PDB file of all heavy atoms in Angstrom:
ATOM      1  N   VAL A   1       0.822  -1.208   0.000  1.00  0.00           N
ATOM      2  CA  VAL A   1       0.005   0.003   0.008  1.00  0.00           C
ATOM      3  C   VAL A   1       0.859   1.258  -0.002  1.00  0.00           C
ATOM      4  O   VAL A   1       0.390   2.335   0.363  1.00  0.00           O
ATOM      5  CB  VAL A   1      -0.999   0.044   1.193  1.00  0.00           C
ATOM      6  CG1 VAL A   1      -2.016  -1.100   1.056  1.00  0.00           C
ATOM      7  CG2 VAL A   1      -0.256  -0.068   2.516  1.00  0.00           C
ATOM      8  N   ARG A   2       2.120   1.123  -0.414  1.00  0.00           N
ATOM      9  CA  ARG A   2       2.984   2.286  -0.563  1.00  0.00           C
ATOM     10  C   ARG A   2       3.019   2.734  -2.007  1.00  0.00           C
ATOM     11  O   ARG A   2       3.148   1.922  -2.919  1.00  0.00           O
ATOM     12  CB  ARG A   2       4.399   2.018  -0.016  1.00  0.00           C
ATOM     13  CG  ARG A   2       5.201   3.285   0.186  1.00  0.00           C
ATOM     14  CD  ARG A   2       6.568   3.067   0.844  1.00  0.00           C
ATOM     15  NE  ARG A   2       6.477   2.699   2.251  1.00  0.00           N
ATOM     16  CZ  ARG A   2       6.636   1.462   2.686  1.00  0.00           C
ATOM     17  NH1 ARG A   2       6.888   0.475   1.827  1.00  0.00           N
ATOM     18  NH2 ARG A   2       6.560   1.188   3.987  1.00  0.00           N
ATOM     19  N   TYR A   3       2.858   4.039  -2.228  1.00  0.00           N
ATOM     20  CA  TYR A   3       2.766   4.545  -3.590  1.00  0.00           C
ATOM     21  C   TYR A   3       3.525   5.864  -3.654  1.00  0.00           C
ATOM     22  O   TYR A   3       3.152   6.853  -3.037  1.00  0.00           O
ATOM     23  CB  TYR A   3       1.285   4.757  -3.956  1.00  0.00           C
ATOM     24  CG  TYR A   3       1.034   5.276  -5.351  1.00  0.00           C
ATOM     25  CD1 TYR A   3       1.278   4.488  -6.467  1.00  0.00           C
ATOM     26  CD2 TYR A   3       0.545   6.574  -5.554  1.00  0.00           C
ATOM     27  CE1 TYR A   3       1.056   4.972  -7.741  1.00  0.00           C
ATOM     28  CE2 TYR A   3       0.327   7.066  -6.838  1.00  0.00           C
ATOM     29  CZ  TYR A   3       0.575   6.260  -7.916  1.00  0.00           C
ATOM     30  OH  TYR A   3       0.348   6.742  -9.172  1.00  0.00           O
ATOM     31  N   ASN A   4       4.632   5.861  -4.414  1.00  0.00           N
ATOM     32  CA  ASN A   4       5.524   7.023  -4.473  1.00  0.00           C
ATOM     33  C   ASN A   4       5.965   7.474  -3.079  1.00  0.00           C
ATOM     34  O   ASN A   4       5.987   8.669  -2.795  1.00  0.00           O
ATOM     35  CB  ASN A   4       4.905   8.156  -5.274  1.00  0.00           C
ATOM     36  CG  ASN A   4       4.791   7.824  -6.764  1.00  0.00           C
ATOM     37  OD1 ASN A   4       5.564   7.039  -7.301  1.00  0.00           O
ATOM     38  ND2 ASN A   4       3.804   8.431  -7.428  1.00  0.00           N
ATOM     39  N   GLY A   5       6.299   6.506  -2.250  1.00  0.00           N
ATOM     40  CA  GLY A   5       6.785   6.780  -0.912  1.00  0.00           C
ATOM     41  C   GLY A   5       5.710   7.026   0.130  1.00  0.00           C
ATOM     42  O   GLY A   5       5.987   7.074   1.331  1.00  0.00           O
ATOM     43  N   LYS A   6       4.453   7.188  -0.301  1.00  0.00           N
ATOM     44  CA  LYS A   6       3.343   7.497   0.589  1.00  0.00           C
ATOM     45  C   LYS A   6       2.487   6.268   0.892  1.00  0.00           C
ATOM     46  O   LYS A   6       2.167   5.499  -0.012  1.00  0.00           O
ATOM     47  CB  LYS A   6       2.437   8.586   0.003  1.00  0.00           C
ATOM     48  CG  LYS A   6       2.920  10.025   0.226  1.00  0.00           C
ATOM     49  CD  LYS A   6       2.076  11.046  -0.587  1.00  0.00           C
ATOM     50  CE  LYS A   6       0.583  10.736  -0.538  1.00  0.00           C
ATOM     51  NZ  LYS A   6      -0.257  11.625  -1.414  1.00  0.00           N
ATOM     52  N   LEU A   7       2.103   6.091   2.144  1.00  0.00           N
ATOM     53  CA  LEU A   7       1.139   5.039   2.466  1.00  0.00           C
ATOM     54  C   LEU A   7      -0.229   5.571   2.111  1.00  0.00           C
ATOM     55  O   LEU A   7      -0.624   6.633   2.599  1.00  0.00           O
ATOM     56  CB  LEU A   7       1.233   4.683   3.955  1.00  0.00           C
ATOM     57  CG  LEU A   7       2.560   4.106   4.434  1.00  0.00           C
ATOM     58  CD1 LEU A   7       2.470   3.766   5.905  1.00  0.00           C
ATOM     59  CD2 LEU A   7       2.947   2.878   3.616  1.00  0.00           C
ATOM     60  N   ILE A   8      -0.950   4.835   1.264  1.00  0.00           N
ATOM     61  CA  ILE A   8      -2.250   5.287   0.754  1.00  0.00           C
ATOM     62  C   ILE A   8      -3.468   4.457   1.231  1.00  0.00           C
ATOM     63  O   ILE A   8      -4.573   4.695   0.774  1.00  0.00           O
ATOM     64  CB  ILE A   8      -2.261   5.378  -0.772  1.00  0.00           C
ATOM     65  CG1 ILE A   8      -2.025   3.985  -1.390  1.00  0.00           C
ATOM     66  CG2 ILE A   8      -1.237   6.426  -1.242  1.00  0.00           C
ATOM     67  CD1 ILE A   8      -2.225   3.913  -2.904  1.00  0.00           C
ATOM     68  N   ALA A   9      -3.213   3.511   2.132  1.00  0.00           N
ATOM     69  CA  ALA A   9      -4.258   2.667   2.677  1.00  0.00           C
ATOM     70  C   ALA A   9      -3.684   1.857   3.818  1.00  0.00           C
ATOM     71  O   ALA A   9      -2.462   1.760   3.957  1.00  0.00           O
ATOM     72  CB  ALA A   9      -4.810   1.725   1.609  1.00  0.00           C
ATOM     73  N   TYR A  10      -4.571   1.282   4.642  1.00  0.00           N
ATOM     74  CA  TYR A  10      -4.169   0.348   5.688  1.00  0.00           C
ATOM     75  C   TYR A  10      -4.232  -1.071   5.123  1.00  0.00           C
ATOM     76  O   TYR A  10      -5.283  -1.474   4.615  1.00  0.00           O
ATOM     77  CB  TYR A  10      -5.138   0.413   6.879  1.00  0.00           C
ATOM     78  CG  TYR A  10      -5.011   1.696   7.669  1.00  0.00           C
ATOM     79  CD1 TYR A  10      -5.766   2.821   7.346  1.00  0.00           C
ATOM     80  CD2 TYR A  10      -4.131   1.774   8.740  1.00  0.00           C
ATOM     81  CE1 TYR A  10      -5.649   3.992   8.055  1.00  0.00           C
ATOM     82  CE2 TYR A  10      -4.001   2.927   9.452  1.00  0.00           C
ATOM     83  CZ  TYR A  10      -4.762   4.040   9.118  1.00  0.00           C
ATOM     84  OH  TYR A  10      -4.622   5.205   9.856  1.00  0.00           O
ATOM     85  N   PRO A  11      -3.135  -1.815   5.247  1.00  0.00           N
ATOM     86  CA  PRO A  11      -3.203  -3.214   4.838  1.00  0.00           C
ATOM     87  C   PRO A  11      -3.965  -4.055   5.845  1.00  0.00           C
ATOM     88  O   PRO A  11      -3.772  -3.851   7.055  1.00  0.00           O
ATOM     89  CB  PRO A  11      -1.751  -3.676   4.785  1.00  0.00           C
ATOM     90  CG  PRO A  11      -1.019  -2.738   5.744  1.00  0.00           C
ATOM     91  CD  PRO A  11      -1.827  -1.459   5.825  1.00  0.00           C
ATOM     92  N   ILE A  12      -4.793  -4.976   5.356  1.00  0.00           N
ATOM     93  CA  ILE A  12      -5.573  -5.834   6.250  1.00  0.00           C
ATOM     94  C   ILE A  12      -5.154  -7.311   6.254  1.00  0.00           C
ATOM     95  O   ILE A  12      -4.962  -7.902   7.314  1.00  0.00           O
ATOM     96  CB  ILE A  12      -7.079  -5.772   5.899  1.00  0.00           C
ATOM     97  CG1 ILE A  12      -7.559  -4.334   5.770  1.00  0.00           C
ATOM     98  CG2 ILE A  12      -7.888  -6.538   6.945  1.00  0.00           C
ATOM     99  CD1 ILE A  12      -7.378  -3.528   7.061  1.00  0.00           C
ATOM    100  N   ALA A  13      -5.057  -7.901   5.064  1.00  0.00           N
ATOM    101  CA  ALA A  13      -4.738  -9.320   4.986  1.00  0.00           C
ATOM    102  C   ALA A  13      -4.221  -9.733   3.610  1.00  0.00           C
ATOM    103  O   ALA A  13      -4.585  -9.129   2.610  1.00  0.00           O
ATOM    104  CB  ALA A  13      -5.957 -10.172   5.333  1.00  0.00           C
ATOM    105  N   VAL A  14      -3.435 -10.803   3.588  1.00  0.00           N
ATOM    106  CA  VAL A  14      -2.858 -11.320   2.357  1.00  0.00           C
ATOM    107  C   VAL A  14      -3.716 -12.429   1.783  1.00  0.00           C
ATOM    108  O   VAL A  14      -3.984 -13.449   2.432  1.00  0.00           O
ATOM    109  CB  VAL A  14      -1.449 -11.864   2.600  1.00  0.00           C
ATOM    110  CG1 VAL A  14      -0.872 -12.438   1.298  1.00  0.00           C
ATOM    111  CG2 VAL A  14      -0.540 -10.754   3.169  1.00  0.00           C
ATOM    112  N   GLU A  15      -4.152 -12.223   0.543  1.00  0.00           N
ATOM    113  CA  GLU A  15      -5.019 -13.130  -0.188  1.00  0.00           C
ATOM    114  C   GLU A  15      -4.213 -13.823  -1.276  1.00  0.00           C
ATOM    115  O   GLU A  15      -3.654 -13.142  -2.133  1.00  0.00           O
ATOM    116  CB  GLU A  15      -6.139 -12.343  -0.856  1.00  0.00           C
ATOM    117  CG  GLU A  15      -6.946 -11.439   0.084  1.00  0.00           C
ATOM    118  CD  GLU A  15      -8.105 -10.756  -0.608  1.00  0.00           C
ATOM    119  OE1 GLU A  15      -8.086 -10.625  -1.845  1.00  0.00           O
ATOM    120  OE2 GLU A  15      -9.063 -10.330   0.096  1.00  0.00           O
ATOM    121  N   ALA A  16      -4.169 -15.148  -1.243  1.00  0.00           N
ATOM    122  CA  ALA A  16      -3.598 -15.888  -2.373  1.00  0.00           C
ATOM    123  C   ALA A  16      -4.525 -17.035  -2.664  1.00  0.00           C
ATOM    124  O   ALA A  16      -5.049 -17.655  -1.742  1.00  0.00           O
ATOM    125  CB  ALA A  16      -2.214 -16.416  -2.048  1.00  0.00           C
ATOM    126  N   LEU A  17      -4.717 -17.334  -3.947  1.00  0.00           N
ATOM    127  CA  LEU A  17      -5.460 -18.523  -4.362  1.00  0.00           C
ATOM    128  C   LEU A  17      -4.691 -19.780  -3.997  1.00  0.00           C
ATOM    129  O   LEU A  17      -3.467 -19.789  -4.068  1.00  0.00           O
ATOM    130  CB  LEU A  17      -5.690 -18.524  -5.865  1.00  0.00           C
ATOM    131  CG  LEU A  17      -6.539 -17.373  -6.433  1.00  0.00           C
ATOM    132  CD1 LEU A  17      -6.523 -17.423  -7.965  1.00  0.00           C
ATOM    133  CD2 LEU A  17      -7.941 -17.465  -5.914  1.00  0.00           C
ATOM    134  N   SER A  18      -5.423 -20.828  -3.610  1.00  0.00           N
ATOM    135  CA  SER A  18      -4.846 -22.165  -3.386  1.00  0.00           C
ATOM    136  C   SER A  18      -5.690 -23.216  -4.100  1.00  0.00           C
ATOM    137  O   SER A  18      -6.816 -22.953  -4.531  1.00  0.00           O
ATOM    138  CB  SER A  18      -4.837 -22.512  -1.895  1.00  0.00           C
ATOM    139  OG  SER A  18      -3.986 -21.662  -1.121  1.00  0.00           O
ATOM    140  N   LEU A  19      -5.155 -24.426  -4.187  1.00  0.00           N
ATOM    141  CA  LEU A  19      -5.939 -25.560  -4.659  1.00  0.00           C
ATOM    142  C   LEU A  19      -6.749 -26.084  -3.482  1.00  0.00           C
ATOM    143  O   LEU A  19      -6.190 -26.413  -2.432  1.00  0.00           O
ATOM    144  CB  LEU A  19      -5.000 -26.659  -5.175  1.00  0.00           C
ATOM    145  CG  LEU A  19      -5.650 -27.888  -5.791  1.00  0.00           C
ATOM    146  CD1 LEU A  19      -6.482 -27.470  -6.983  1.00  0.00           C
ATOM    147  CD2 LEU A  19      -4.571 -28.889  -6.176  1.00  0.00           C
ATOM    148  N   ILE A  20      -8.069 -26.121  -3.631  1.00  0.00           N
ATOM    149  CA  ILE A  20      -8.923 -26.659  -2.594  1.00  0.00           C
ATOM    150  C   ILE A  20      -9.452 -28.004  -3.096  1.00  0.00           C
ATOM    151  O   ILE A  20      -9.953 -28.107  -4.218  1.00  0.00           O
ATOM    152  CB  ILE A  20     -10.085 -25.712  -2.265  1.00  0.00           C
ATOM    153  CG1 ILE A  20      -9.529 -24.376  -1.735  1.00  0.00           C
ATOM    154  CG2 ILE A  20     -11.031 -26.358  -1.259  1.00  0.00           C
ATOM    155  CD1 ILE A  20     -10.593 -23.270  -1.624  1.00  0.00           C
ATOM    156  N   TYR A  21      -9.293 -29.047  -2.282  1.00  0.00           N
ATOM    157  CA  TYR A  21      -9.608 -30.389  -2.764  1.00  0.00           C
ATOM    158  C   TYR A  21     -10.400 -31.213  -1.785  1.00  0.00           C
ATOM    159  O   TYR A  21     -10.332 -31.029  -0.569  1.00  0.00           O
ATOM    160  CB  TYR A  21      -8.320 -31.140  -3.198  1.00  0.00           C
ATOM    161  CG  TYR A  21      -7.450 -31.588  -2.059  1.00  0.00           C
ATOM    162  CD1 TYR A  21      -7.460 -32.918  -1.628  1.00  0.00           C
ATOM    163  CD2 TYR A  21      -6.607 -30.702  -1.409  1.00  0.00           C
ATOM    164  CE1 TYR A  21      -6.655 -33.349  -0.592  1.00  0.00           C
ATOM    165  CE2 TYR A  21      -5.790 -31.107  -0.360  1.00  0.00           C
ATOM    166  CZ  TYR A  21      -5.821 -32.443   0.055  1.00  0.00           C
ATOM    167  OH  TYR A  21      -5.018 -32.864   1.075  1.00  0.00           O
ATOM    168  N   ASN A  22     -11.201 -32.129  -2.333  1.00  0.00           N
ATOM    169  CA  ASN A  22     -12.011 -33.049  -1.553  1.00  0.00           C
ATOM    170  C   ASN A  22     -11.163 -34.253  -1.162  1.00  0.00           C
ATOM    171  O   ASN A  22     -10.721 -35.023  -2.011  1.00  0.00           O
ATOM    172  CB  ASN A  22     -13.222 -33.486  -2.377  1.00  0.00           C
ATOM    173  CG  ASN A  22     -14.210 -34.288  -1.552  1.00  0.00           C
ATOM    174  OD1 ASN A  22     -13.825 -35.155  -0.767  1.00  0.00           O
ATOM    175  ND2 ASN A  22     -15.484 -34.002  -1.730  1.00  0.00           N
ATOM    176  N   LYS A  23     -10.912 -34.399   0.139  1.00  0.00           N
ATOM    177  CA  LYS A  23      -9.992 -35.420   0.602  1.00  0.00           C
ATOM    178  C   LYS A  23     -10.622 -36.814   0.562  1.00  0.00           C
ATOM    179  O   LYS A  23      -9.921 -37.828   0.564  1.00  0.00           O
ATOM    180  CB  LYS A  23      -9.527 -35.096   2.022  1.00  0.00           C
ATOM    181  CG  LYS A  23      -8.847 -33.718   2.117  1.00  0.00           C
ATOM    182  CD  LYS A  23      -8.838 -33.188   3.554  1.00  0.00           C
ATOM    183  CE  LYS A  23      -7.632 -33.669   4.296  1.00  0.00           C
ATOM    184  NZ  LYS A  23      -7.353 -32.791   5.474  1.00  0.00           N
ATOM    185  N   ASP A  24     -11.956 -36.864   0.549  1.00  0.00           N
ATOM    186  CA  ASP A  24     -12.654 -38.133   0.411  1.00  0.00           C
ATOM    187  C   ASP A  24     -12.512 -38.690  -0.999  1.00  0.00           C
ATOM    188  O   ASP A  24     -12.286 -39.887  -1.187  1.00  0.00           O
ATOM    189  CB  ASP A  24     -14.134 -37.978   0.766  1.00  0.00           C
ATOM    190  CG  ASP A  24     -14.353 -37.752   2.244  1.00  0.00           C
ATOM    191  OD1 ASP A  24     -13.414 -38.034   3.016  1.00  0.00           O
ATOM    192  OD2 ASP A  24     -15.449 -37.315   2.642  1.00  0.00           O
ATOM    193  N   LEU A  25     -12.632 -37.810  -1.995  1.00  0.00           N
ATOM    194  CA  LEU A  25     -12.543 -38.220  -3.390  1.00  0.00           C
ATOM    195  C   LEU A  25     -11.091 -38.348  -3.845  1.00  0.00           C
ATOM    196  O   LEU A  25     -10.771 -39.089  -4.770  1.00  0.00           O
ATOM    197  CB  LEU A  25     -13.261 -37.196  -4.271  1.00  0.00           C
ATOM    198  CG  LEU A  25     -14.769 -37.124  -4.137  1.00  0.00           C
ATOM    199  CD1 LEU A  25     -15.348 -36.077  -5.082  1.00  0.00           C
ATOM    200  CD2 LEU A  25     -15.409 -38.499  -4.389  1.00  0.00           C
ATOM    201  N   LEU A  26     -10.215 -37.617  -3.165  1.00  0.00           N
ATOM    202  CA  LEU A  26      -8.886 -37.375  -3.677  1.00  0.00           C
ATOM    203  C   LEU A  26      -7.883 -37.171  -2.551  1.00  0.00           C
ATOM    204  O   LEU A  26      -7.455 -36.041  -2.285  1.00  0.00           O
ATOM    205  CB  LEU A  26      -8.954 -36.102  -4.539  1.00  0.00           C
ATOM    206  CG  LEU A  26      -7.935 -35.877  -5.641  1.00  0.00           C
ATOM    207  CD1 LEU A  26      -7.966 -37.031  -6.609  1.00  0.00           C
ATOM    208  CD2 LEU A  26      -8.285 -34.564  -6.351  1.00  0.00           C
ATOM    209  N   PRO A  27      -7.537 -38.252  -1.832  1.00  0.00           N
ATOM    210  CA  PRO A  27      -6.603 -38.075  -0.712  1.00  0.00           C
ATOM    211  C   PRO A  27      -5.211 -37.603  -1.137  1.00  0.00           C
ATOM    212  O   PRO A  27      -4.527 -36.954  -0.367  1.00  0.00           O
ATOM    213  CB  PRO A  27      -6.554 -39.475  -0.074  1.00  0.00           C
ATOM    214  CG  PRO A  27      -7.104 -40.409  -1.112  1.00  0.00           C
ATOM    215  CD  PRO A  27      -8.084 -39.619  -1.910  1.00  0.00           C
ATOM    216  N   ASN A  28      -4.818 -37.923  -2.354  1.00  0.00           N
ATOM    217  CA  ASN A  28      -3.562 -37.424  -2.879  1.00  0.00           C
ATOM    218  C   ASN A  28      -3.782 -36.535  -4.093  1.00  0.00           C
ATOM    219  O   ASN A  28      -3.827 -37.023  -5.232  1.00  0.00           O
ATOM    220  CB  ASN A  28      -2.604 -38.579  -3.180  1.00  0.00           C
ATOM    221  CG  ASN A  28      -2.234 -39.384  -1.930  1.00  0.00           C
ATOM    222  OD1 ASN A  28      -1.525 -38.881  -1.039  1.00  0.00           O
ATOM    223  ND2 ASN A  28      -2.732 -40.603  -1.854  1.00  0.00           N
ATOM    224  N   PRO A  29      -3.924 -35.218  -3.864  1.00  0.00           N
ATOM    225  CA  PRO A  29      -4.260 -34.299  -4.947  1.00  0.00           C
ATOM    226  C   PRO A  29      -3.102 -34.205  -5.950  1.00  0.00           C
ATOM    227  O   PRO A  29      -1.958 -34.389  -5.563  1.00  0.00           O
ATOM    228  CB  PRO A  29      -4.453 -32.979  -4.206  1.00  0.00           C
ATOM    229  CG  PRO A  29      -3.553 -33.072  -3.034  1.00  0.00           C
ATOM    230  CD  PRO A  29      -3.682 -34.506  -2.593  1.00  0.00           C
ATOM    231  N   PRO A  30      -3.421 -33.913  -7.216  1.00  0.00           N
ATOM    232  CA  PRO A  30      -2.412 -33.859  -8.275  1.00  0.00           C
ATOM    233  C   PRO A  30      -1.364 -32.796  -8.043  1.00  0.00           C
ATOM    234  O   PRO A  30      -1.692 -31.658  -7.697  1.00  0.00           O
ATOM    235  CB  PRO A  30      -3.234 -33.504  -9.535  1.00  0.00           C
ATOM    236  CG  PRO A  30      -4.478 -32.875  -9.025  1.00  0.00           C
ATOM    237  CD  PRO A  30      -4.761 -33.585  -7.715  1.00  0.00           C
ATOM    238  N   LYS A  31      -0.092 -33.156  -8.217  1.00  0.00           N
ATOM    239  CA  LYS A  31       0.982 -32.174  -8.086  1.00  0.00           C
ATOM    240  C   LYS A  31       1.123 -31.327  -9.357  1.00  0.00           C
ATOM    241  O   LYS A  31       1.733 -30.247  -9.311  1.00  0.00           O
ATOM    242  CB  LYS A  31       2.301 -32.891  -7.779  1.00  0.00           C
ATOM    243  CG  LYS A  31       2.408 -33.437  -6.355  1.00  0.00           C
ATOM    244  CD  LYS A  31       2.449 -32.294  -5.352  1.00  0.00           C
ATOM    245  CE  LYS A  31       2.599 -32.801  -3.921  1.00  0.00           C
ATOM    246  NZ  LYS A  31       1.371 -33.463  -3.439  1.00  0.00           N
ATOM    247  N   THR A  32       0.588 -31.808 -10.473  1.00  0.00           N
ATOM    248  CA  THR A  32       0.784 -31.135 -11.760  1.00  0.00           C
ATOM    249  C   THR A  32      -0.537 -30.883 -12.486  1.00  0.00           C
ATOM    250  O   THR A  32      -1.488 -31.644 -12.319  1.00  0.00           O
ATOM    251  CB  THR A  32       1.690 -31.939 -12.730  1.00  0.00           C
ATOM    252  OG1 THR A  32       0.994 -33.118 -13.190  1.00  0.00           O
ATOM    253  CG2 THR A  32       2.985 -32.363 -12.047  1.00  0.00           C
ATOM    254  N   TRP A  33      -0.580 -29.821 -13.284  1.00  0.00           N
ATOM    255  CA  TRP A  33      -1.749 -29.550 -14.132  1.00  0.00           C
ATOM    256  C   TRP A  33      -1.878 -30.637 -15.192  1.00  0.00           C
ATOM    257  O   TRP A  33      -2.986 -31.028 -15.582  1.00  0.00           O
ATOM    258  CB  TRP A  33      -1.569 -28.213 -14.854  1.00  0.00           C
ATOM    259  CG  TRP A  33      -2.004 -26.985 -14.077  1.00  0.00           C
ATOM    260  CD1 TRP A  33      -1.210 -26.157 -13.349  1.00  0.00           C
ATOM    261  CD2 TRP A  33      -3.327 -26.456 -13.987  1.00  0.00           C
ATOM    262  NE1 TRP A  33      -1.959 -25.147 -12.799  1.00  0.00           N
ATOM    263  CE2 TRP A  33      -3.270 -25.301 -13.166  1.00  0.00           C
ATOM    264  CE3 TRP A  33      -4.572 -26.849 -14.515  1.00  0.00           C
ATOM    265  CZ2 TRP A  33      -4.397 -24.533 -12.862  1.00  0.00           C
ATOM    266  CZ3 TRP A  33      -5.692 -26.081 -14.215  1.00  0.00           C
ATOM    267  CH2 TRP A  33      -5.598 -24.925 -13.400  1.00  0.00           C
ATOM    268  N   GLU A  34      -0.733 -31.115 -15.687  1.00  0.00           N
ATOM    269  CA  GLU A  34      -0.714 -32.086 -16.786  1.00  0.00           C
ATOM    270  C   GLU A  34      -1.456 -33.371 -16.456  1.00  0.00           C
ATOM    271  O   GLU A  34      -2.013 -34.015 -17.352  1.00  0.00           O
ATOM    272  CB  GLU A  34       0.732 -32.387 -17.188  1.00  0.00           C
ATOM    273  CG  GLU A  34       1.442 -31.241 -17.919  1.00  0.00           C
ATOM    274  CD  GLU A  34       2.051 -30.198 -16.991  1.00  0.00           C
ATOM    275  OE1 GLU A  34       1.699 -30.154 -15.787  1.00  0.00           O
ATOM    276  OE2 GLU A  34       2.907 -29.419 -17.464  1.00  0.00           O
ATOM    277  N   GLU A  35      -1.461 -33.744 -15.184  1.00  0.00           N
ATOM    278  CA  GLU A  35      -2.082 -35.006 -14.812  1.00  0.00           C
ATOM    279  C   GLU A  35      -3.586 -34.868 -14.571  1.00  0.00           C
ATOM    280  O   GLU A  35      -4.257 -35.858 -14.263  1.00  0.00           O
ATOM    281  CB  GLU A  35      -1.376 -35.636 -13.611  1.00  0.00           C
ATOM    282  CG  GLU A  35      -1.696 -35.011 -12.271  1.00  0.00           C
ATOM    283  CD  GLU A  35      -0.603 -35.312 -11.252  1.00  0.00           C
ATOM    284  OE1 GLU A  35       0.387 -34.555 -11.224  1.00  0.00           O
ATOM    285  OE2 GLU A  35      -0.725 -36.315 -10.499  1.00  0.00           O
ATOM    286  N   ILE A  36      -4.120 -33.666 -14.737  1.00  0.00           N
ATOM    287  CA  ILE A  36      -5.549 -33.403 -14.515  1.00  0.00           C
ATOM    288  C   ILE A  36      -6.545 -33.965 -15.549  1.00  0.00           C
ATOM    289  O   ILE A  36      -7.639 -34.409 -15.178  1.00  0.00           O
ATOM    290  CB  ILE A  36      -5.809 -31.898 -14.193  1.00  0.00           C
ATOM    291  CG1 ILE A  36      -5.187 -31.540 -12.830  1.00  0.00           C
ATOM    292  CG2 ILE A  36      -7.292 -31.578 -14.178  1.00  0.00           C
ATOM    293  CD1 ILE A  36      -5.324 -30.078 -12.414  1.00  0.00           C
ATOM    294  N   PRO A  37      -6.194 -33.933 -16.854  1.00  0.00           N
ATOM    295  CA  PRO A  37      -7.101 -34.587 -17.806  1.00  0.00           C
ATOM    296  C   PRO A  37      -7.300 -36.068 -17.491  1.00  0.00           C
ATOM    297  O   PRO A  37      -8.434 -36.550 -17.485  1.00  0.00           O
ATOM    298  CB  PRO A  37      -6.362 -34.441 -19.131  1.00  0.00           C
ATOM    299  CG  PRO A  37      -5.579 -33.175 -18.979  1.00  0.00           C
ATOM    300  CD  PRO A  37      -5.123 -33.186 -17.539  1.00  0.00           C
ATOM    301  N   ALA A  38      -6.203 -36.770 -17.193  1.00  0.00           N
ATOM    302  CA  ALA A  38      -6.287 -38.215 -16.903  1.00  0.00           C
ATOM    303  C   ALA A  38      -7.113 -38.444 -15.641  1.00  0.00           C
ATOM    304  O   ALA A  38      -7.924 -39.380 -15.577  1.00  0.00           O
ATOM    305  CB  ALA A  38      -4.900 -38.799 -16.731  1.00  0.00           C
ATOM    306  N   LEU A  39      -6.910 -37.589 -14.645  1.00  0.00           N
ATOM    307  CA  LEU A  39      -7.659 -37.707 -13.392  1.00  0.00           C
ATOM    308  C   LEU A  39      -9.123 -37.436 -13.618  1.00  0.00           C
ATOM    309  O   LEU A  39      -9.980 -38.083 -13.019  1.00  0.00           O
ATOM    310  CB  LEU A  39      -7.072 -36.752 -12.339  1.00  0.00           C
ATOM    311  CG  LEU A  39      -7.852 -36.673 -11.025  1.00  0.00           C
ATOM    312  CD1 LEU A  39      -7.807 -38.009 -10.261  1.00  0.00           C
ATOM    313  CD2 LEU A  39      -7.280 -35.560 -10.157  1.00  0.00           C
ATOM    314  N   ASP A  40      -9.445 -36.496 -14.497  1.00  0.00           N
ATOM    315  CA  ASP A  40     -10.844 -36.197 -14.749  1.00  0.00           C
ATOM    316  C   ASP A  40     -11.559 -37.395 -15.408  1.00  0.00           C
ATOM    317  O   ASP A  40     -12.714 -37.680 -15.094  1.00  0.00           O
ATOM    318  CB  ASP A  40     -10.993 -34.940 -15.614  1.00  0.00           C
ATOM    319  CG  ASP A  40     -12.452 -34.558 -15.864  1.00  0.00           C
ATOM    320  OD1 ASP A  40     -13.173 -34.215 -14.886  1.00  0.00           O
ATOM    321  OD2 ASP A  40     -12.878 -34.582 -17.037  1.00  0.00           O
ATOM    322  N   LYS A  41     -10.844 -38.087 -16.288  1.00  0.00           N
ATOM    323  CA  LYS A  41     -11.406 -39.247 -16.965  1.00  0.00           C
ATOM    324  C   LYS A  41     -11.824 -40.241 -15.886  1.00  0.00           C
ATOM    325  O   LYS A  41     -12.987 -40.647 -15.807  1.00  0.00           O
ATOM    326  CB  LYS A  41     -10.379 -39.865 -17.911  1.00  0.00           C
ATOM    327  CG  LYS A  41     -10.969 -40.774 -19.000  1.00  0.00           C
ATOM    328  CD  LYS A  41      -9.876 -41.366 -19.882  1.00  0.00           C
ATOM    329  CE  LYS A  41     -10.411 -42.515 -20.743  1.00  0.00           C
ATOM    330  NZ  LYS A  41      -9.303 -43.283 -21.387  1.00  0.00           N
ATOM    331  N   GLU A  42     -10.867 -40.599 -15.032  1.00  0.00           N
ATOM    332  CA  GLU A  42     -11.084 -41.527 -13.917  1.00  0.00           C
ATOM    333  C   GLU A  42     -12.303 -41.157 -13.060  1.00  0.00           C
ATOM    334  O   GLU A  42     -13.060 -42.037 -12.656  1.00  0.00           O
ATOM    335  CB  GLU A  42      -9.829 -41.619 -13.066  1.00  0.00           C
ATOM    336  CG  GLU A  42      -9.949 -42.559 -11.872  1.00  0.00           C
ATOM    337  CD  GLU A  42      -9.220 -42.042 -10.636  1.00  0.00           C
ATOM    338  OE1 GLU A  42      -7.971 -41.899 -10.691  1.00  0.00           O
ATOM    339  OE2 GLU A  42      -9.899 -41.764  -9.623  1.00  0.00           O
TER     340      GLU A  42
END
């Protein structure tokens, strides 16, 4: 929230996307995007 040396807002929290997975259906979630088509077939 710093802009040209000036603080222009109060920071509240850090948001990052994650992979959210169903552990019942998928106890070992895919490490790679590439393996997702095959997993979808299954």
Side-chain angles (χ1 to χ4, degrees):
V1 295
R2 195 175 288 103
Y3 181 70
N4 291 333
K6 277 171 43 186
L7 297 182
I8 62 171
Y10 289 89
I12 311 300
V14 178
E15 306 184 339
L17 297 173
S18 295
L19 184 61
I20 298 169
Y21 73 102
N22 188 317
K23 303 160 87 160
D24 289 343
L25 291 181
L26 205 56
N28 298 290
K31 287 292 182 290
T32 71
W33 275 96
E34 288 84 344
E35 76 202 86
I36 292 178
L39 174 65
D40 182 64
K41 200 181 166 192
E42 180 217 297

